[PDB]
Amino acid sequence: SKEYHIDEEVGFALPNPQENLPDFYNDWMFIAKHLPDLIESGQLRERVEKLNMLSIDHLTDHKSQRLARLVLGCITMAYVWGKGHGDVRKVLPRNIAVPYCQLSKKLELPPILVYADCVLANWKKKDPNKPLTYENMDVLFSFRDGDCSKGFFLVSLLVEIAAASAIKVIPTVFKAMQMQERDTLLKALLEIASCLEKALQVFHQIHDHVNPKAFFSVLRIYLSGWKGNPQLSDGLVYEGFWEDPKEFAGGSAGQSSVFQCFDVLLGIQQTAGGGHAAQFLQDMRRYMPPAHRNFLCSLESNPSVREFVLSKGDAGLREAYDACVKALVSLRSYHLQIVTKYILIPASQQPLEAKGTGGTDLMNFLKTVRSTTEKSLLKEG
Ligand code: HEM
Ligand SMILES: N[C@@H](Cc1c[nH]c2ccccc12)C(=O)O
Ligand SMILES: [C-]#N
């Protein structure tokens, strides 16, 4: 669909994003491309403060603006967190803060590195003739040496793309409901379950390409933001553009449109009830590109797939619907095994509730979200 910016091959991911900006923005591009050296050297904060206020008017198209958001995003995280020890800047310089805020307001995103920046736009194809696989792909920007950002962002991207194979089946589902096509609806649901099952298998790759200790103690702090964060409790002031400190949540796959959309499709009311988990998942829609925010909107306006399946007294159709719900439970149960390996165990090894980069009480949050998904199982009900 061209209206919602959903690619046939890669879904919500930005298809074939640009690898370089125009020569007017070469000051920006140099800093972002050598973050591993400049942060380790300890001269990044000096280089950002001593830099001119470049204008956003020269960026012609969407892909250039998204690359600029990624460049400015990675820079802003590197500036604020620094080496990642404790010395954090609570104020972003006017020369970098103003254009980045204006670029963010143009794309209707917040001025912080989001999922759409560091995963959906932060990749390339080595050889265009070869298919989309880990060995044939590479990220555009990293933070540190040995941070496993290549493995992390690409395995994240590959799961997106796998799960996004079920997006093209969604028009078939609602058309089948409108026309009362039982066999088509059942086949479409089983196909969606199959894509979500394959997304879980693609998740297994994370164990090969990402080291837990590297992830937890190096990379994870550069994905953290400044909403519900003791290190920047009042917020982060943007010099020139805003008056008071402004709070924005750090990045997470809570900001992914694909996993939020299957909860909506299947009638799993994650964003209902007024609890803290519902609040986060609804709030993270502000951190998605406006077209994907519009897609989740369009999806919610359709009649309930759940209500349709429950009314028919049809064991095959219930089972097909349940395959999709089971597949989301499996995915989230496995995601919690990843959380145990990559957050909990590393955290216990270093010398009250643990916070995610997105800013949630992660164990309560994730187990609530899974529990809500488990509640939607029919079990031939
Ligand atoms: C090292 C890898 C990963 C870790 C440590 C991790 C950890 C977490 C944490 C702590 C949250 C809670 C939100 C926050 O406050 O930040 C979260 C949310 C989420 N993560 Fe991950 N995550 C990882 C990779 C992935 C991958 C590959 C996916 C792919 C499907 C995924 C899907 C989600 C989703 C969908 C949410 C939102 C809550 C939900 O719908 O279940 N994550 N993750
Ligand atoms: N929220 C995760 C980090 C994470 C996983 N996937 C992401 C995608 C984008 C940004 C951050 C992430 C954590 O607390 O460890
Ligand atoms: C996943 N954050």
Residue numbers in the entry: 12 to 362, 374 to 403
Copy out sentences from the published article reporting this entry, exactly as the authors wrote them.
Trp binding in the Sa site induces the organization of the C-terminal fragment of the highly disordered JK-Loop (referred to as the JK-LoopC hereafter) into a β-hairpin structure, while the N-terminal fragment of the loop (referred to as the JK-LoopN hereafter) unexpectedly remains disordered. The substrate Trp binds in the distal heme pocket, which is enclosed by the JK-LoopC and the DE-Loop, and is capped by a small helix from the N-terminal domain. The binding site is lined with a group of hydrophobic residues, including F226, L234, F163, V130, and Y126. The indole group of the Trp, lying perpendicular to the heme, occupies the so-called “A site”. Its indoleamine group H-bonds with S167 via an intervening water molecule. The ammonium and carboxylate groups extend into the so-called “B site”, forming an interlaced H-bonding network with the conserved “GTGG” motif in the JK-LoopC and the G262 in the DE-Loop, as well as the 7-propionate group of the heme. The carboxylate group is further secured by ion-pairing with R231, which plays a critical role in substrate binding and recognition. Together, these interactions force the iron-bound CN to adopt an unusual bent conformation (with the Fe–C–N angle of ~137°) and position its nitrogen atom next to the C2 atom of the Trp in an oxyanion hole, made up by the indoleamine and ammonium groups of the Trp and the peptide amide group of A264. The active site structure is distinct from that of hTDO, but it resembles that of the hIDO1-O2-Trp complex predicted by QM/MM simulations, offering a direct evidence supporting the hypothesized radical addition mechanism. The Trp-binding site is completely shielded from the bulk solvent, except that a tunnel penetrating from bulk solvent into the distal and proximal heme pockets is evident (displayed as the tint lightblue surface in Fig. 1a).
hIDO1 is a heme-containing enzyme that catalyzes the first and rate-limiting step of the kynurenine pathway—the dioxygenation of Trp to N-formyl kynurenine (NFK). It negatively regulates cellular immune response via depleting Trp and promoting the accumulation of kynurenine pathway metabolites. HIDO1 is an α-helical protein, made up by a large C-terminal domain containing the Sa site and a small N-terminal domain sitting on top of it. Here we report the structures of the wild-type hIDO1 in complex with Trp, an inhibitor (epacadostat), and/or an effector (IDE), as well as comparable structures of an active site mutant, F270G.
